[PDB]
Amino acid sequence: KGEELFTGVVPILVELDGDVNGHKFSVSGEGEGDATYGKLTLKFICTTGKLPVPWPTLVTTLVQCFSRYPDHMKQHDFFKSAMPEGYVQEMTISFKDDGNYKTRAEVKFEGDTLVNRIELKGIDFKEDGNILGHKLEYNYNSHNVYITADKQKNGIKANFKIRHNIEDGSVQLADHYQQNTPIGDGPVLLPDNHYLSTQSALSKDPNEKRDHMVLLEFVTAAGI
Numbered sequence: 330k331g332e333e334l335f336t337g338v339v340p341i342l343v344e345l346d347g348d349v350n351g352h353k354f355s356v357s358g359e360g361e362g363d364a365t366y367g368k369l370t371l372k373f374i375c376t377t378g379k380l381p382v383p384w385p386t387l388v389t390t391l392v393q394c395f396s397r398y399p400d401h402m403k404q405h406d407f408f409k410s411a412m413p414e415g416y417v418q419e420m421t422i423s424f425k426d427d428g429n430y431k432t433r434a435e436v437k438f439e440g441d442t443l444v445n446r447i448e449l450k451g452i453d454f455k456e457d458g459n460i461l462g463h464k465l466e467y468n469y470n471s472h473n474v475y476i477t478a479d480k481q482k483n484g485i486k487a488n489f490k491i492r493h494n495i496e497d498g499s500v501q502l503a504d505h506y507q508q509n510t511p512i513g514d515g516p517v518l519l520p521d522n523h524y525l526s527t528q529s530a531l532s533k534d535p536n537e538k539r540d541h542m543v544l545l546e547f548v549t550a551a552g553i
């Protein structure tokens with residue numbers, strides 16, 4: 330059973346290949362998760378050079394199996410129930426008045442390591458918009474990820490709106506539509522409606538010259 334794999338600290342690897350308006354890039358991340366505390370600590374590096382989009386726009390794409398599900402809600406934790414075989418996570422991320430990302434990720438164990446492998450495609454971004462113009466602040470607001478069951482796909486859907494702070498005081502909305510489906514043929518937990526309360530802090534490694542992001546995140550299930 331999947332939740333048993335998450336009682337301790339688990340190493341995490343994240344590998345993303347991206348193309349946004351023909352700008353090709355890759356990101357590699359390493360860190361660890363401790364679902365007992367809903368806690369993630371990761372460092373991401375752009376391995377191809379400078380990142381052509383703002384780091385905050387990639388946070389939702391770059392492992393909700395590390396959410397803390399309170400004991401009384403453990404029957405609603407799809408994400409761990411799909412492990413170790415894993416799940417596919419697909420998102421459409423619609424940036425208001427701008428372009429969109431489409432992502433497809435596979436999240437699964439490789440040995441004792443939780444791996445998130447992602448392909449991201451971004452299209453129809455404005456050259457001097459907040460994304461390609463790098464007008465987003467290097468910070469991150471707290472959000473609720475609203476989860477519903479998708480019985481016919483044996484999985485879940487999520488809907489939420491990320492509020493990215495713009496450097497002039499305004500907000501760039503990024504609407505998210507998410508679908509997750511198990512990779513394996515074993516049974517999974519199909520949840521009642523609930524949400525994940527997520528808090529994220531972005532920072533820099535003072536000794537790192539590559540383009541990078543240090544992320545500390547807490548994710549807690551609620552709403553039941």
Ligand SMILES: [Mg+2]
Nearest residue numbers: 428452453454
């Ligand atoms: Mg077109």
